[PDB]
């Protein structure tokens, strides 16, 4: 699989990985929303959301 | 899954010592950071030294600091200080089992300091105990660092573990329990403390 | 200043319901996460569980250690500002000092301060109070140090005085000792100039709450 792996609002960035899923993880710090993209579909700690797909650089947005 | 940190570590005063817990990805690698370091003083509450996102608690020292590198959390002291030996807990929050993990603990001691040779005193059992067919002999060791010692009984020739004192030197407590009749009929019992190639033995015997 | 302090029965026996109360101050119950925490004597720190404030939004009300899911409940009441434990189905390996916990996240789950309070000891035994006895410990460089002996009581919790406090400097009350016997004995000691020792008086106040014994022994 292909997985975004860009943070935030920075430039967009790939990555292969051998798991099957990509992810978008976000979550709020003291001005604004923080996203962490990568890939697998990871749990979270309360107060995160989370959002997996199972197709190539499908956790862009 | 588990975290896991060495039992021991040792550190000269004034020197860096970390301490390492070795975790997950689940756990002290999940992002968004959440890694706690408490203090423990033996016989005392934990304090927080470090939490959530190796933030520092307040009136904490800022030689306390702690850092992440993969799953791997670290605290470092930037200059150990007496004060500093303790056990050192690190926990962290696991997204998988949704708990709160702890480590098993680092003890923290302090070498190099200058070394306070023990004061021993050894009581017999009072004319009540004997009275209650029982002998119960005290050995009170105080005012000795570093704070690692040996106690050794005998006769005719259950310890506690060292904890600190007020003043910032180590103490021990020592009982030999025996029956009325085994110590009424002894000839000498003695207390023997070994601590820094030193060793001081003070005696007390069936009286009148 | 969060101050958190435990209350509850410090005896309980085996198959019994454990119900421990923390009375918390200067952090809000009702935003702030709070929970509990356990230490076995001799052993190592055991999360217990929390109960989650209004602060993180998505998550769970409660969370829980899983070792312990289907004996334990945590609830609180945000009036009373108090937090609660019930823990059922008791075992020796229940025995342990009890913390309760408070948590100040602002953005997510343990981002924020843990406070913590003194702990309370709950012991899981089928046995029942032993009062201690107090005797003295006295013996024959310009200092000389007496004490008194608390010996074969049950449950663990004891505290020592001396003079009724009026005296701190150079006391040490020593840890506990469990012997064979199933009982448990300490010591406390004062270091005094060897002067007062034919000028001044000294007696030791020992106390045991579990079995509200409170003694007074004099050397």
């Known amino acids: 699989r292909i997985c975004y792996n860009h943070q935030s609002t920075t430039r967009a960035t790939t990555k292969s990985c051998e798991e099957n899923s990509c992810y978008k993880k976000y979550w709020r710090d003291h001005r604004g929303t923080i996203i962490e993209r990568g890939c697998g579909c990871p749990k979270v700690k309360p107060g995160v959301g989370i959002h997996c797909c199972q197709s190539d650089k499908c956790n862009y947005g | 899954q588990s975290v896991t940190q060495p039992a021991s570590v040792s550190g000269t005063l004034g020197q860096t010592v970390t301490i390492s817990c070795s975790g997950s990805k689940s756990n002290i690698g999940d992002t968004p950071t959440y890694v706690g370091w408490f203090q423990q003083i033996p016989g005392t509450a934990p304090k927080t030294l470090i939490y959530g996102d190796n933030r520092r608690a307040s009136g904490v020292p800022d030689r306390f600091s702690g850092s992440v590198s993969g799953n791997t959390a670290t605290l470092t002291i930037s200059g150990v200080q007496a004060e500093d030996e303790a056990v050192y807990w690190c926990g962290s929050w696991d997204v998988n089992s949704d708990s709160e993990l702890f480590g098993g603990g680092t003890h923290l001691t302090i070498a190099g300091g200058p070394t306070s040779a023990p004061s021993v005193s050894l009581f017999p059992p009072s004319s009540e105990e004997l009275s209650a067919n029982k002998a119960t002999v005290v050995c009170l060791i105080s005012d000795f660092s570093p704070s690692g010692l040996e106690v050794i009984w005998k006769v005719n020739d259950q310890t506690t573990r060292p904890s600190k004192q007020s003043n910032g030197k180590y103490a021990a407590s020592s009982y030999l329990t025996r029956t009325s009749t085994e110590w009424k009929s002894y000839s000498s019992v003695s207390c023997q403390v070994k601590h820094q190639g030193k060793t001081v033995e003070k005696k007390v015997s069936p009286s009148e | 200043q969060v101050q958190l302090t435990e209350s509850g029965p410090g005896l309980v026996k085996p198959s019994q319901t454990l119900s421990l109360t923390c009375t918390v101050s200067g952090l809000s119950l009702s935003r702030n996460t709070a929970g509990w925490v356990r230490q076995a004597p001799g052993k190592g720190l055991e999360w217990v569980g929390d109960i989650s404030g209004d602060g993180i939004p998505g998550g769970e009300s409660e969370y829980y250690n899983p070792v312990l899911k289907p004996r334990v409940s945590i609830t609180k009441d945000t009036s009373k500002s108090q937090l609660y434990l019930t823990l059922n189905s008791l075992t020796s390996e229940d025995t342990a000092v009890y913390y309760c916990?408070?948590?100040?996240?602002?953005?997510?789950?343990?981002?924020?301060?843990?406070?913590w309070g003194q702990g309370i000891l709950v012991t899981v035994s089928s046995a029942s109070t032993t009062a201690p006895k107090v005797f003295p410990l006295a013996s024959h460089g310009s200092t000389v140090a007496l004490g008194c002996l608390v010996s074969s009581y049950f449950p663990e919790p004891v505290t020592v005085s001396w003079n009724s406090g009026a005296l701190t400097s150079g006391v040490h009350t020593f840890p506990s000792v469990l012997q064979s016997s199933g009982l448990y004995s300490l010591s406390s000691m004062v270091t005094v100039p060897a002067s007062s020792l034919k000028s001044q008086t000294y007696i030791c106040n020992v106390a045991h709450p579990a079995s509200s014994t409170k003694v007074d022994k004099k050397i």
């Open positions: 916990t408070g948590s100040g996240d602002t953005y997510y789950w343990r981002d924020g301060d843990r406070y």
